[PDB]
């Protein structure tokens, strides 16, 4: 057993933004990542509105159907429900806050259809 949980994204990690901010994982606002990506040029936020969410039967797998951009190009991507999706102007969420908080100790809001998910590009 370690002193605390893993330092990567697990609850209590001190996450450093591109603007230099040092904030707890659980407190990071979407605006925090927005700014960090915008202040940077090798990094960027994306606006993908989940239009549908389907369970894939597979263990903890749900495909979030996103409409990428205002041209609403739909992408059906099978993701594990324990993936915490940062949502552009919608909040710090996960497809299953229960599981994300259970396994990673990390609290999340419910990522549901309508939530414009942040796709962030690490160049």
């Amino acid at each position: 057993a370690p002193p605390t949980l893993p330092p990567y994204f697990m609850k209590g990690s001190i996450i450093q933004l591109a603007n230099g901010e040092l904030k707890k994982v659980e407190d990071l606002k979407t605006e925090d990542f927005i700014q960090s990506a915008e202040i940077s040029n090798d990094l960027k936020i994306d606006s993908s509105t989940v239009e549908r969410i389907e369970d894939s039967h597979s263990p903890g797998v749900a495909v979030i159907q996103f409409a990428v951009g205002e041209h609403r190009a739909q992408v059906s991507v099978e993701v594990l429900v324990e993936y915490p999706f940062f949502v552009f102007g919608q909040g710090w969420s996960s497809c299953c806050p229960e599981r994300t908080s259970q396994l990673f100790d990390l609290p999340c809001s419910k990522l549901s259809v309508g939530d414009v998910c942040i796709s962030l590009t690490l160049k």
Binding site: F9, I14, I15, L17, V25, D46, F66, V79, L120
Partner: peptide
């Protein structure tokens, strides 16, 4: 610290 891209997932390579 950890580089802030630690909890932000990608909805697969978007178009």
């Amino acid at each position: 610290v950890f580089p802030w891209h630690s909890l932000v997932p990608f909805l697969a390579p978007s178009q």
